[PDB]
Amino acid sequence: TTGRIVAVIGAVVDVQFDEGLPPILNALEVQGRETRLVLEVAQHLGESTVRTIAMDGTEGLVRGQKVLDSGAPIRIPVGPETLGRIMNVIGEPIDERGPIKTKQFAAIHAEAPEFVEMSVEQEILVTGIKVVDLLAPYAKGGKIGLFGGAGVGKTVLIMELINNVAKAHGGYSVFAGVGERTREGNDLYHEMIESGVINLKDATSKVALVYGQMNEPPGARARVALTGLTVAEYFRDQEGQDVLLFIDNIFRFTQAGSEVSALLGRIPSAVGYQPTLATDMGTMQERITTTKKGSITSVQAIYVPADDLTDPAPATTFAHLDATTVLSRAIAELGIYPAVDPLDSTSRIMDPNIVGSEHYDVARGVQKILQDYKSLQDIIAILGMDELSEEDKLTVSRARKIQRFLSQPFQVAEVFTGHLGKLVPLKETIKGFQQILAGEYDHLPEQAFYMVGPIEEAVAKADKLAEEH
Amino acid sequence: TTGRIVAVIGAVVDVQFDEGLPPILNALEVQGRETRLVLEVAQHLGESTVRTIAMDGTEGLVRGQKVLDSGAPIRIPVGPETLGRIMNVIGEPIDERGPIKTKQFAAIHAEAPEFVEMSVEQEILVTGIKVVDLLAPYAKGGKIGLFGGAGVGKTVLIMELINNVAKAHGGYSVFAGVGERTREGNDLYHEMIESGVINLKDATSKVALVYGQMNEPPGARARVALTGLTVAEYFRDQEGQDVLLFIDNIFRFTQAGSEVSALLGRIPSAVGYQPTLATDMGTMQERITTTKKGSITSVQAIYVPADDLTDPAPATTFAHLDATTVLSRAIAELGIYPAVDPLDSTSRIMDPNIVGSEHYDVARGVQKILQDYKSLQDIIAILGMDELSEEDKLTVSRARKIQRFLSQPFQVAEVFTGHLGKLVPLKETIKGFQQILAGEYDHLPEQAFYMVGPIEEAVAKADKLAEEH
Amino acid sequence: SDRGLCGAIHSSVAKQMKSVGD
Amino acid sequence: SSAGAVRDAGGAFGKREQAEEERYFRARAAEQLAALKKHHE
Amino acid sequence: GKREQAEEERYFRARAAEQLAALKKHHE
Amino acid sequence: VDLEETGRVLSIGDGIARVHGLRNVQAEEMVEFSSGLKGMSLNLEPDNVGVVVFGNDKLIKEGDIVKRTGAIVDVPVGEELLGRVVDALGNAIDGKGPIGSKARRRVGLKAPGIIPRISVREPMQTGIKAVDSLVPIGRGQRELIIGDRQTGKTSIAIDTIINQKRFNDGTDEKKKLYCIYVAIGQKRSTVAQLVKRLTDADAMKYTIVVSATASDAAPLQYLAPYSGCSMGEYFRDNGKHALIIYDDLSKQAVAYRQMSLLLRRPPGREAYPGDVFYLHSRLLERAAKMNDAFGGGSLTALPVIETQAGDVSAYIPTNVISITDGQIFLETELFYKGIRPAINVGLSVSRVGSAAQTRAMKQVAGTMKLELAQYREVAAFALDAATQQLLSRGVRLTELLKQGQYSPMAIEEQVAVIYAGVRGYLDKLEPSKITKFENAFLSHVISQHQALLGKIRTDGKISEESDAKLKEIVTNFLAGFEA
Amino acid sequence: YFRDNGKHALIIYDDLSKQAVAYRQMSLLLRRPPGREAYPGDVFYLHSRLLERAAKMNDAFGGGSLTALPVIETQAGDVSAYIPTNVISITDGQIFLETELFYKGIRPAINVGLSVSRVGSAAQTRAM
Amino acid sequence: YFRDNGKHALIIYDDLSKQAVAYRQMSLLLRRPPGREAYPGDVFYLHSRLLERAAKMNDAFGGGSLTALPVIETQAGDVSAYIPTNVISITDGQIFLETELFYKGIRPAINVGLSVSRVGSAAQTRAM
Amino acid sequence: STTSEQSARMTAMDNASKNASEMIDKLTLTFNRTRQAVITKELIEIISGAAAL
Ligand SMILES: Nc1ncnc2c1ncn2[C@@H]1O[C@H](COP(=O)(O)OP(=O)(O)OP(=O)(O)O)[C@@H](O)[C@H]1O
Ligand SMILES: Nc1ncnc2c1ncn2[C@@H]1O[C@H](COP(=O)(O)OP(=O)(O)O)[C@@H](O)[C@H]1O
Ligand SMILES: Nc1ncnc2c1ncn2[C@@H]1O[C@H](COP(=O)(O)OP(=O)(O)O)[C@@H](O)[C@H]1O
Ligand SMILES: [Cl-]
Ligand SMILES: [Cl-]
Ligand SMILES: [Cl-]
Ligand SMILES: [Cl-]
Ligand SMILES: [Cl-]
Ligand SMILES: [Cl-]
Ligand SMILES: [Mg+2]
Ligand SMILES: [Mg+2]
Ligand SMILES: [Mg+2]
């Protein structure tokens, strides 16, 4: 059915249909365009007219320009053909490698899995990172979040998880470039070909790709997150297998909504955000989860504006997550990388019944001394280290060594650090921090524990520091 | 052609013409009134109707009152006859000395000088004040800006510069009373007659007065800044003379705009200001400049609302200035006058090429030790001077002596202060502070440096204190 | 004495010496 | 209000306390590295 | 603080007396 | 008669024309008024067209015949603009005849996608000691110049432009870099001095100046950064490399805020529109490094942001920090103390510190990066004898970071000045006397020892022979300096 | 139902902070006036009437009870925020929880000095 | 009336802070752009025209005067607030009154440092 | 010597707490002024937003 454009202001477009009025969340094919300009319905205004949002630039659009109704939402390719291929928000490919001819398609909009469909299987996932696996370990078949401010190491952290976990994972993966730098998309695409997870000449690709980035409009950036998970929903539902879902950055979903919230006709909420924040996030977030049939293990990078965790966009996301990784600038500026907050990052699986009493006691033991270290820092500001007692001096010594041993050089960040990357096992992490708390490395200096893999390398590095000195 | 007043709300008045609708900026004479009421055309609302801004009070206006069109903006007298005469916003004489007879008239509105017409020669201007000439020295044919809160010392500072520079300078002068005290207009008028710069009988006056004070409505205060501006343009362009413009206060232009923008039918900006803040100021400020033919050295007093420099009105003005003079309350309340902030006030001519390397190194040296003194205030607050290091005691001791030596008795301030004013040359200032930084006057007390001219009088004041014991 | 934060005692001792306790 | 509030502010006391710890453990690192010389040799 | 000035001004008012006591002796 | 391709003005005020008619007009299309002025149709409404007015709006009365251009807003592009100073639309404003460009690129084109791009390889030499060593800018990168007013923000940009004379006068084509300085908001007298400075240093011959001062209307200030970006994309696509400076994006945001609100679009945070992130992102994203297939060229962005009272946590600053690749935090505290340029080494980062540095520079800068980091930890003190030289070295190296205006140094020359401090020939020398040392040392090394600087550029590293020569040059100079 | 028919009951609102966000979304889209922090004018009244219904009945009106345990999420430990101060002023006491006390080892992390129960001190077994 | 007819008069506005709140009520009910502390843009103009009218007339215009003594209520000694700074920028000096000196017993509690009189120093008896 | 330093440290730390108390009192006022202004300013954003619909 035909419908002519009546108004165009910014990304928002109004189309008046003569009789056959389309439902909400339906794709609208705009005729008389060189590139495919698709519109999606948001509101019914009245008088057989509907308000829409543009999945691309609106320049060139004329009033009275015909726009046909598809009779369905934004339908995209889903299947094995999507693997090793980048695509738009609308579904078309963008890597100059022909059309992605899948045998079956799927709409980006769909109802979330019901309460009865929910799983309750808490199984530990051994990543490789020490600060993660010890304090806030990720659950296999669970929702993982990576909070952080401007330039604290969210991309470097998530790219390491792709490098470590996806290779070991005998299955599939889906990367989602939501509202971030297109330069990063260029970096990620080519380096995955070098590793061999995306093969060019043959169809044995592990990682599927969906992109949008901050060059695109808000309407695009609002829906790429939904476009990304829909590909992973195929690998969950139809193919009875596990799947990973790396998203970066999921703040840009919530940001992109507020960019067109005023033009849709809404009274703005607190901190200049849209009123529909909890619901718009909720309908999207709860789709990204493990059902009884399949299992999505999602990893979401979350941008924190102005390092403010109390801001609506990061704050509301905490409820949707099982495991969290709260990054800090204060920890990053010292030199600790990954700058993971040991007194903030938590996980649901952190329980003596789940992970064992040895894991729980050592993990909490690290969190005990690091919290008590903050109290001593207030005393040191007035006195100094000299006036403190013998017991308090040792607590700081053990605390500062624990801070540095939590740091670790990544394989993805070789050019940044300089040193080669590491990957520590489970019990090597448990036994490493247990020896430091017990007092087995009081004689060694704190510099030896800075940027190393297991506890053995700290003792091995102390041999070099001794001979150099 | 005749026009009818359809609506009147405060300063804003709407006029409906049948045919021959007047363009924007054109003045409109309101008929059936005792004093000459003027309405400048702001907008075209549509349906043969225009929105206007009233230069005088809008009381007594009946709906359907006849309004004529002059066919041009608010035209005012300009020439040698405007010297020693007081004008108002609409060019009329408000000194009760007949009409200002001139052979040419100028409109208050005009476009700024083009890129080709701009000048490049920035020569230094010697004020006499110590804190100014050392840290943020003014330029001949530039744009000086005196920032300050409520009662810090702007009118004292501007009258000092009028006393020093404008008296001893072979060229014309202009003063613009934009939204300040009418009492100050009375004081300035009789002071200038007493001095000689204004002459009642002889036609050899230097200063040209324009006044639209805080007793006037917003329409006057919005446009009276431009009225005084246009007088300086005549002397710059058509004659080619060195002009001295003195606007007190420039904030009142922007404040007047904030009052009308509500009634003009606009969406309010940040802190309730008009959305056209930068552009309205931009068209105004850009006219005040040194062209190829003539020259203007504008000294503008700038008000700071609630002692907040981040406020839109004082914030936007910074870009328009060559030299800044940020007056602080914290400095004033300590007793230091003039209360110019040495870690805030800056100038463009502060450069090793222009002033000299001896000037530059001493200037930054004063700023360094003051910055070190300010950093240690938290330590002195809790712990005290005893807990500081012995080298830091010398750093703090000199800084307070430098703070006090930056103070200076004023010429205009003699009437209430009692102490005689000072006028320190450029060479003596740099020589004086350089001795204190190196440490040639460490043995002398701090109160010796408080309120003195050159460094020689500071040492002489210390001997007077030694005699009293 | 060794422990600081006690007025100007350490400097007061140094006053008479020029003209124990680390 | 909360613990560790001094270094969170990042003022005079916050940065000086961070420097004060760095002074102490640099000196203790030299003493402890000297102990590794004796045990090795 | 208000008493931040109290401690600092007390220090330099004492040092002003000491410096003026040294200045008066040299004046003789 | 005609209402399809033509329209009449219903209402006009504050540079916003509501035009009846213009039925066939496109969104973001240019339109010419009866007086002669141009305008951009942004708001397409059912019974009107919200047209923003480029320039003055006094001449536009009610019922003026608004024509159609029949094309999306575009600007002139090419190598002809190099030398000329132009306005936001592209007209000449320096009084040297009308320029005749070959092509005309659109203002608001999409940024190149994932496949055309390639990682940053070749360096973008600013010629500043503190920048190229610690925060190295690569070609294709977007490096922010954030800081308060009067803290040497534009000072970095001007010295970067003057530095390119070293490369552009040479024979090598790849090493050349054409500059584009966009002036948004700042007054004409400032820009007149900037063009004067570039003319004196022989910099204008490879530079384009896109002026949009406070006297010009808000739509011109809004459009000017995009107009300048399109001029850079001419080089980007066709082999050559280019540089662009958005000075500044803060004053662009205020113009966009004014333009948006007067079209009856609702406000957001601090009265700004909802899409102010989208405003700056699409502008910056267009700066990229192209692969060999599409051209090989690139565009390097240097945006500017003005923070109020050092508040980087403000709305517009936090947006641009997350967009840009790296950032250079300039502070007032360092400026007043004497450290000019006032770059905070602890806070500022590049995120590509490897390819953007030369192998000669990587040796001396790598060690200086470590030593300065060691110093800033143990800063607030002045005592330990073991780390006495550590406190000294940091003060000695920090004095070398000072650099006067309008004098950018070569990449090989920067290795020489750091070599003296890093190897410890300034340790026994007093901190105050280091400015006098380097001034005479740089003049000495350039005058007589040209072959040594040449061989570092030839070999592309600090060789065994070159290291041996510099060892005796500094020691003999140091002895002559003191005694 | 339990309260009015002689029996006792417990109710736990987890959490009322998120309820306010939902109520805010509903009001703003209906174009009702926005109050402080974009919440509607009667955001106090929302939680006040909800909690007030929780009561203890005398023997004449059955004798039952509905016990309310509402939940509020503070931002950075700010007790004096808008939504917390409403619900704090409604209830008959409160149990403050700190992130500082949790990591130190105090679990449950109940702040003893700040937390009080005004009415329930009387309603206790004498053995305790 | 007294001013113009060769006579002298004193006027006291007690207080302009409460007048500002009354005008803010009017402006906020009128639905006009609010700024600092929700006051309108013309809140300065409100107090400026009132105070300006108090003046000293020359012998040509009767030779009388009107003397203004406006009052402002600060909040915890906030002299740098919006409405106080406006009236400070209008009037010819001011008399600050401290809560410390008044509570301590020193009445009247005039702050010596902050309080000034510009044109009053000239109009003073030589004995004083 | 030991009796002199403890008496001095008592009075020195007594002054340190009292000087800190003065800073707390004044910062509490500046906190509450800024607290109210943030509530007022952010409310005006929402009212201005609703007006333009
Ligand atoms: N390294 C330096 N050496 C000497 N002078 C400097 C240096 N850096 C900055 N300056 C001086 O500081 C002044 C202001 O610098 P600049 O023009 O960069 O300010 P800005 O940060 O761009 O702000 P604005 O846009 O308001 O001018 C200039 O007059 C310049 O001479
Ligand atoms: N594991 C790490 N090791 C060393 N440096 C890191 C690490 N992670 C991040 N960084 C630093 O941070 C920057 C990259 O951060 P990025 O991932 O872009 O943060 P964000 O995603 O929050 O913008 C680089 O400059 C790099 O030096
Ligand atoms: N140079 C100075 N020396 C001493 N006192 C001064 C000086 N400048 C200003 N003052 C004091 O400040 C008061 C107000 O000055 P004024 O110029 O009216 O400030 P503003 O113009 O900001 O209202 C005067 O009454 C005067 O006592
Ligand atoms: Cl808002
Ligand atoms: Cl007047
Ligand atoms: Cl206006
Ligand atoms: Cl606001
Ligand atoms: Cl052309
Ligand atoms: Cl654009
Ligand atoms: Mg990232
Ligand atoms: Mg004044
Ligand atoms: Mg600049």
Question: Taking the domains of chain E in order of start, what are their residue ranges?
Answer: 1-28
| Residue F356 token pair | 């953007």
Rounded distance from Cα B447 to ligand 3 centre (Å): 21
Q: Which of B30, B55, B73 is the last residue of a domain?
A: B73
| Residue A191 token pair | 């380096």
Domain F2-71 fold:
Elongation Factor Tu (Ef-tu); domain 3 (2.40.30)
* Residue in I16, I42, I49 nearest the CB of A262: I49
Claim to verify: residue B308 and residue B403 sit in the same structural domain: no
| Residue A334 token pair | 């010292």
* Residue in I5, I11, I12 nearest the CB of C1: I5
CATH code given to domain E1-28: 1.20.5.500
Residues on chain C touching B387 (C-beta within 8 angstroms) = 4-5
Name residue, tokens 């206007």.
Answer: B52
Interface of C with B in 1-22 (CB under 8 A): 4-5, 7-8, 11
* Rounded alpha-carbon distances, angstroms, from residue G95 to B463, G15, G69, G85, G110: 69, 15, 10, 14, 7
* Rounded alpha-carbon distances, angstroms, from residue B463 to A292, E18, F477, H76: 94, 14, 48, 44
Helix (H) or strand (E) holding H89: none
Active-site position among F8, F351, F423, F457: F351
Q: What are phi and psi of B210, to 5 degrees?
A: -135, 135
Helix (H) or strand (E) holding F471: helix F464-482
Query: Other CB atoms closer than 10 Å to residue D21's CB: what's the count?
Result: 20
Residues on chain I touching A271 (C-beta within 8 angstroms) = 42
E1 in B contact zone (CB under 8 Å): yes
DSSP 3-state assignment of B123? Answer: strand
Cβ neighbours of residue B155 closer than 8 Å, sequence gap 6 or more: B180, B184, B248, B301
Q: How far apart are CA F182 and CA F193, in angstroms?
A: 14
Q: Which of A31, A57, A73 is the last residue of a domain?
A: A73
| Closest atom of ligand 1 to CA, residue F151 | 21
Q: How far apart are CA H65 and CA H4, in angstroms?
A: 7
Question: Which residue intervals of F286-355 are DSSP H helices?
Answer: 315-323, 332-337
Contact call for residues F302 and F244 (beta carbons, < 8 A): yes
Claim to verify: residue B373 and residue B271 sit in the same structural domain: no
* Residue in A385, A396, A462 nearest the CB of D36: A462
Contact call for residues A269 and A226 (beta carbons, < 8 A): no
In terms of residue numbers, what domain contains B412?
A: 350-469
Domain count, chain B: 3
| Closest atom of ligand 3 to CA, residue B155 | 17
Helix (H) or strand (E) holding F392: helix F388-400
Distance from CA of D41 to the nearest CA of F (A): 23
Number of C-alpha atoms within 13 angstroms, CB side, residue F177? 26
Helix (H) or strand (E) holding G117: strand G116-117
Burial degree of B94 (CB within 10 A; 0-12, 13-18, 19+): middle
Measured at the alpha carbon of residue E14, what is the angle toward residues E10 and E20, in degrees to the nearest 5? 145
Q: Is A181 a catalytic residue?
A: yes
A8 Rama sector, left if φ>0, alpha if ψ -120 to 50, beta otherwise? beta
| Closest atom of ligand 1 to CA, residue F155 | 18
Burial H3-30 (b: 16+ CB within 10 A, else e): beeeeeeeeebeebbebbeebbeebeee
Nearest chain F residue to D16 by CA: give it.
Answer: F380
Query: Other CB atoms closer than 10 Å to residue G71's CB: what's the count?
Result: 13
Helix (H) or strand (E) holding B119: none
A303 lines ligand 2 (CB under 6 A): no
Q: How far apart are CA F3 and CA A462, in angstroms?
A: 84
User: Ligand 3 site: residues with CB under 6 angstroms?
Assistant: B 148, 151-156, 337-338, 410, 413, 417; H 89, 116, 118
Taken in order B245, B251, B256, B258, is the CA torsion positive or negative? positive
Q: How far apart are CA B306 and CA B149, in angstroms?
A: 7
Quick one: three-class SS letters along F20-78? EECCCCECCEEEECCCCCEEEEEEECCCCEEEEECCCCCCCCCCCEECCCCCECEEEEC
CATH code of B318's domain: 3.40.50.300
Cβ neighbours of residue A464 closer than 8 Å, sequence gap 6 or more: none
| Residue B77 token pair | 């007298």
Strand-pairing partners, residue H70, are H13
Name residue, tokens 């430091």.
Answer: A436
Q: Which of B73, B97, B126 is the last residue of a domain?
A: B73
Pairing label, strands F143-147, F304-306: parallel
Query: Other CB atoms closer than 10 Å to residue H51's CB: what's the count?
Result: 20
CATH code of A1's domain: 2.40.10.170
CATH code of A388's domain: 1.10.1140.10
How many H-runs (helices) and E-runs (strands) does chain G carry?
4, 4
Contact call for residues H30 and H42 (beta carbons, < 8 A): no
Are chains E and F in contact at 3+ CB pairs closer than 8 Å? no
Q: How far apart are CA A138 and CA A346, in angstroms?
A: 9
Pairing label, strands B27-30, B38-44: antiparallel
Cβ neighbours of residue F12 closer than 8 Å, sequence gap 6 or more: B24, B43, B44, F18, F57, F60, F61, F62, F64
Pairing label, strands B242-248, B295-296: parallel
Instruction: Assign 3-state DSSP to chain G and report helix, strand, coil percentages, each to 5.
Output: 35, 15, 55
Taken in order B113, B118, B121, B122, is the CA torsion positive or negative? positive
Query: Other CB atoms closer than 10 Å to residue H103's CB: what's the count?
Result: 10
Q: Preceding residues of all breaks in chain G (C to N beyond 2.5 angstroms)?
A: none
DSSP 3-state assignment of F145? Answer: strand
Q: How far apart are CA G116 and CA G93, in angstroms?
A: 5
Read out DSSP for A278-342? HHHHHHHHTTSS-BSS-EEEEEEEEE-GGG-TTSHHHHHHGGG-SEE--B-HHHHHHT-SS-B-T
Burial I1-12 (b: 16+ CB within 10 A, else e): eeeebeebbeeb
Method used to solve the structure = X-ray
Q: Would the CB atoms of B217 and H122 count as touching at under 8 Å?
A: no
Pairing label, strands B138-140, A67-69: unpaired
Claim to verify: residue B69 and residue B85 sit in the same structural domain: no
Strand-pairing partners, residue A247, are A176, A300
Claim to verify: residue A221 and residue A133 sit in the same structural domain: yes
How many residue pairs from chains A and I have C-beta atoms closer than 8 A?
18
Resolution in A: 3.3
The conformation of residue H124, written as its DSSP 8-state character, comes to: S
Strand-pairing partners, residue F207, are F179
Q: Would the CB atoms of E24 and B466 count as touching at under 8 Å?
A: yes
Claim to verify: residue A169 and residue A250 sit in the same structural domain: yes
Rounded to a whole number of angstroms, the CA Rg of chain G reads 17
Top residue of I44, I45, I47 to mutate, by most chain B CBs within 10 Å, is I44
Name residue, tokens 């600090």.
Answer: F462
F185 lines ligand 1 (CB under 6 A): no
Number of C-alpha atoms within 13 angstroms, CB side, residue A343? 25
A235 lines ligand 2 (CB under 6 A): no
Number of C-alpha atoms within 13 angstroms, CB side, residue F478? 18
Nearest chain B residue to E6 by CA: give it.
Answer: B381
Q: How far apart are CA F195 and CA F460, in angstroms?
A: 35
Contact call for residues F151 and F330 (beta carbons, < 8 A): yes
Task: Tell the residue nearest (CA) to atom 28 of ligand 1.
Answer: B348
Nearest to F301 by CA among F331, F279, F325, F317: F325
Domain boundary assignment for chain F: 2-71, 72-357, 358-482
Nearest to B99 by CA among B107, B110, B87, B109: B87
Ligand number with the minimum distance to the CA of B52 = 6
Claim to verify: residue B372 and residue B245 sit in the same structural domain: no
Are chains A and G in contact at 3+ CB pairs closer than 8 Å? yes
Rounded distance from Cα F78 to ligand 9 centre (Å): 20
Nearest to A209 by CA among A181, A188, A180: A188
B315 lines ligand 1 (CB under 6 A): no
Q: How far apart are CA A31 and CA A34, in angstroms?
A: 9
Q: How far apart are CA B310 and CA A39, in angstroms?
A: 42
Q: How far apart are CA F390 and CA A76, in angstroms?
A: 61
Nearest to F358 by CA among F119, F124, F117, F118: F124
Claim to verify: residue A251 and residue A113 sit in the same structural domain: yes
Q: Is A151 annotated as a binding residue?
A: yes
| Closest atom of ligand 2 to CA, residue A303 | 22
CATH code given to domain F72-357: 3.40.50.300
| Residue H17 token pair | 């802070």
The CA-based diameter of chain E, rounded to the nearest angstrom, is 42
Q: How far apart are CA D25 and CA D33, in angstroms?
A: 12
Q: Would the CB atoms of D19 and F387 count as touching at under 8 Å?
A: no
Answer yes or no: CATH 3.40.50.1970 is held by domain D1-41. no
Neighbouring chains to I with at least 3 Cβ pairs closer than 8 Å? A, B, C, E, F, G, H
Name residue, tokens 């590293």.
Answer: F461
Top residue of D13, D15, D23 to mutate, by most chain B CBs within 10 Å, is D13
Residues on chain A touching D37 (C-beta within 8 angstroms) = 466, 469
Dihedral (C-alpha) C3, C8, C12, C14: value to the nearest 10 degrees?
50
The conformation of residue B237, written as its DSSP 8-state character, comes to: I
Q: Is B155 annotated as a binding residue?
A: yes
CATH superfamily of F358-482: ATP synthase alpha/beta chain, C-terminal domain (1.20.150.20)
Ligand number with the minimum distance to the CA of B273 = 7
Cα–chain-centroid distance for residue B391?
Answer: 42
How many residue pairs from chains B and H have C-beta atoms closer than 8 A?
76
Contact call for residues B450 and B407 (beta carbons, < 8 A): yes
Claim to verify: residue A58 and residue A186 sit in the same structural domain: no
B466 in E contact zone (CB under 8 Å): yes
Q: How far apart are CA F253 and CA F366, in angstroms?
A: 38
Quick one: three-class SS letters along H9-47? EEEEECCHHHHHHHHHHHHHHHCCCCCHHHCCCCHHHHH
Interface of I with G in 11-40 (CB under 8 A): 39
Query: Other CB atoms closer than 10 Å to residue A242's CB: what's the count?
Result: 18
